[PDB]
Design a protein around this ligand. Structure first.
Ligand SMILES: O=C1N[C@@H](Cc2c[nH]c3ccccc23)C(=O)Nc2ccccc21
Ligand SMILES: O=C1N[C@@H](Cc2c[nH]c3ccccc23)C(=O)Nc2ccccc21
Ligand code: NA
Ligand code: NA
Lengths: 408, 408
């Protein structure tokens, strides 16, 4: 009978990849991508549209295929790749997203180093296919949040070593495509860590400096003040920024942090900005987070990022979302799931969907997870579902995304 | 509501063409291609497969886009292009085919001239996508049926002029892809006219010489003898060859001729090989051809190929099909339809399908023709449906294909 990934099998009979690495990225990503698009109820047409777009637009910027022991520029999306799938679950339905670090082979071979050009090459193709994508924020924010030529001359290798052992990747930019039924919306992430290593500034300062340069009037100013005071009280210096690649007036900004202390308490604190967020949605969500944290038994690692990376454990993360006319900043919790067995996570997620009146999601969650990882044993797997994001508004209800790691 | 060519509209949102000419060939061919695949009841998957294959494999070898007054290598498929669609109609259903002359820009710019390399480039990509395609016959037949380097040195321009004014194109090779539900089958056509201009040999001799070199044993020998005696009695020297690109033992050969005398009588004669074909199928088909010729009122031009090309009129053609274990050669009539109004042709075709118990074909023929040529007036058009092929076996019934010309 007709396999779930028939669209991948079909396109494979028609596409000619110009090199082995694109080929390998296609056969590595497209199967699971095809399946998620079926699960999320995308039309057959929209399924081919986005698989084909993946082949044509994304595969060429995923870089050399990172076979074990191969000396190429490395990234950590999806665990060890330059690309990572994720899936959003809501009452209104499911949506697939694909995040990746644009990269070309020149970054592996001495001819870029901090990989600053590939994203520009990528946006120049993307904007041909999706007219709504506006890269004005890329041109505005790069200077504030990524390593300039002047920053690079003032860098020394003892400070780059120290950032790499703590954080691993030289990555400045990630891009993500939200594959919405109403058309792609592209998002860009900026990573100021290496810039900050060279300048002596903090990541948060850089991120809030970036926002204020773009927000000439100050509609986002009080929202910024609020988050900035929490970062200062909680002694947090590292941060990174995301934005929608749409007209600057209509974009949303999101400031990410990472805390290595994976306790519910530390999550509670960040979630409420230390008690500065008082809205009803934020209190209803906190009580849900308490239930999920407990049930999932999210694992406390150590603070040392050496021995945390050894055991394959991840920190907690949050982003605080800001938009022009927004009254309060909107929090989102990223809970780490590595070291938790995929059947356990499916048992909880299925019961969570039951509780919050999402029977369609509950009914198929497990069999879908199994088909993404066909043939594999989900009681023995711990590193397939890697993050669960959470957010809540009274109108739309619970917002949760699962971020997937590629199988070993 | 959802347009018939939604698959073209969808793929357009995902494909990146590397040059303007591929782009223009896509927007020129893919709409009608998308529609034919819908009409023939191809699965949605198989529709995307073949449209995408068109984009990836065929568009790159269709050459520079031949805008009016543009100085490029010209071909006459579809009237004035390097590509031509056609559609087969049977009791068992409808099938689309796409014929084209592989060509690269180098043929327009002094760097090929008789366009001998592009087909080799094309087969090297085709064989990556469709494993069943076997080009052994291309390697065997080229020498016999196309201009070698030795032939080219013995050519003079007064003989090339004389062949061009009579036949127009320098074309040596055409390829066609039968887009069957069970997988592509590729066919190659060889045009010995220019070779023959240089060597002093006749086209038929060359074609039968080619067959006999490939048919080491002689299973096709008596079939050849039969056709050869008719060509000799009817004083016919020009011919060309087609074959299936499959294993040589299992291929079918087809020898084409063109007769400028467009009378039913001349068609009758060729159809029966001058009375040498006595099978029941051949007599039942002749009586059908008589009915269709009369109803369509196929137009008698003149014999002079100068004033025949002026009025836009075409000769009659036939191919005689031969296979290993076949007892008699199987005839196929190509009736020319240019100068006949498309509504008249649709009225006859619809009544023909009625008569021969093909109600599904009859019901939709007209509305399909209109949608291929959307917005256009079909009583005023005369050059959209250009050929109707006919063949008949008692088992499968009438075999008819319509070959389409591109709209002015
Ligand atoms: O592997 C990475 N993970 C992120 C968090 C993250 C995980 N998945 C993501 C998807 C899109 C954007 C960010 C993420 C992260 O926290 N740090 C980085 C920084 C640079 C390059 C990759 C990563
Ligand atoms: O325009 C051409 N028509 C053919 C007959 C024909 C018409 N449609 C075709 C499709 C495939 C193969 C042959 C044909 C024909 O008779 N002559 C030629 C020869 C070389 C290049 C093109 C043509
Ligand atoms: Na897990
Ligand atoms: Na006509």
């Amino acid at each position: 009978p007709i396999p779930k990934d028939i669209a991948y099998h079909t396109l494979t009979k028609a596409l000619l990849f110009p090199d082995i690495d694109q080929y390998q990225h296609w056969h590595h990503v497209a199967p699971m991508l095809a399946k998620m698009l079926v699960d999320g109820k995308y039309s057959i047409h929209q399924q081919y549209e986005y698989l084909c777009l993946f082949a044509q637009l994304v595969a060429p910027v995923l870089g050399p295929y990172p076979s074990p022991g191969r000396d190429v520029y490395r990234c950590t999306l999806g665990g060890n790749m330059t690309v990572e799938l994720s899936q959003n679950f809501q009452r209104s339905g499911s949506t697939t997203r694909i995040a990746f670090e644009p990269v070309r082979y020149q970054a592996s071979v001495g001819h870029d180093r901090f990989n600053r050009t590939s994203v520009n090459a990528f946006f120049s193709q993307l904007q041909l296919l999706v007219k709504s994508v506006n890269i004005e924020l890329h041109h505005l924010l790069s200077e504030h949040l990524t390593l300039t030529a002047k920053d690079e001359r003032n860098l020394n290798e003892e400070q780059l070593t120290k950032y790499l052992t703590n954080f691993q990747v030289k990555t400045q930019y990630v891009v993500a495509l939200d594959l919405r039924k109403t058309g792609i919306v592209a998002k860009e992430y900026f990573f100021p860590g290496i810039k900050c290593a060279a300048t002596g500034q903090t990541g948060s300062n850089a991120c809030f400096g970036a926002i204020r340069a773009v927000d000439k009037d100050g509609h986002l100013d009080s929202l910024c003040q609020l988050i900035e005071a929490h970062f200062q009280q909680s002694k947090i210096d590292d941060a990174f920024l995301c934005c929608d690649l749409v007209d600057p007036a209509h974009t949303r900004f999101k400031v990410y942090i990472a805390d290595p202390l994976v306790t519910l308490a530390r999550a509670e604190e960040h979630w409420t900005l230390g008690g500065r967020l008082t809205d009803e949605d934020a209190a209803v969500g906190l009580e849900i987070i308490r239930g999920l944290w407990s049930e999932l038994g999210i694992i406390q690692g150590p603070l040392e990022p050496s021995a945390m990376m050894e055991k394959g454990l991840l920190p907690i993360m949050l982003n605080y979302e800001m938009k022009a006319g927004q009254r309060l900043p909107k929090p989102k919790l990223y809970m780490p799931l590595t070291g938790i067995p995929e059947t356990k996570i499916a048992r909880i997620m299925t019961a969570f969907f039951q509780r919050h009146d999402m029977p369609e999601q509950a009914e198929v969650f497990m069999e879908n997870l199994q088909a993404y990882y066909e043939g594999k044993n989900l009681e023995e797997a711990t590193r397939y579902q890697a993050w669960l994001s959470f957010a809540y508004t009274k109108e739309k209800g619970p917002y949760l995304s699962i971020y997937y790691f590629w199988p070993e």
